[PDB]
Design a protein around this ligand. Structure first.
Ligand SMILES: Cc1ncccc1N[C@@H]1CCCS(=O)(=O)C1
Length: 116
């Protein structure tokens, strides 16, 4: 609280590390459904159903332009990609399974990088 400071983790490397993680995501062979925004005029229903679209290129743009206040907000957007995917795609569809794979891939890198 006021004048009662918690020790807080060193965050100086967070931008670099998130960029590294995002690069690994981008180059994953199953990244293809998520590299660019869902084409709202190619994919019937997407605009109405998915309230907050997100994709890797948008995350990359926000990361490169200082639009994430902290690593938690970065993780929010990454997870949003896979949450959207799970909302819209069947689990065993190519895109659906890609989403599950990419989520697992992200969460391990996340834990390995930041959680001691
Ligand atoms: C992640 C996702 N969620 C719902 C529908 C489709 C997709 N991926 C598509 C893959 C390439 C072209 S696209 O059709 O615009 C987007």
């Amino acid at each position: 609280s006021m004048s009662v400071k918690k020790p807080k983790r060193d965050d100086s490397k967070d931008l670099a590390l998130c960029s590294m993680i995002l690069t690994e995501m981008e180059t994953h062979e199953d990244a293809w459904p998520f590299l660019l925004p869902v084409n709202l005029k190619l994919v019937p229903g997407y605009k109405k159903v998915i309230k907050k679209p997100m994709d890797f290129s948008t995350i990359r743009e926000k990361l490169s332009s200082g639009q994430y206040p902290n690593l938690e907000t970065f993780a929010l957007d990454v997870r949003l990609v896979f949450d959207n995917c799970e909302t819209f795609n069947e689990d065993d569809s190519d895109i659906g399974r890609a989403g599950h794979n990419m989520r697992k891939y992200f969460e391990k890198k996340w834990t390995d990088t930041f959680k001691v």
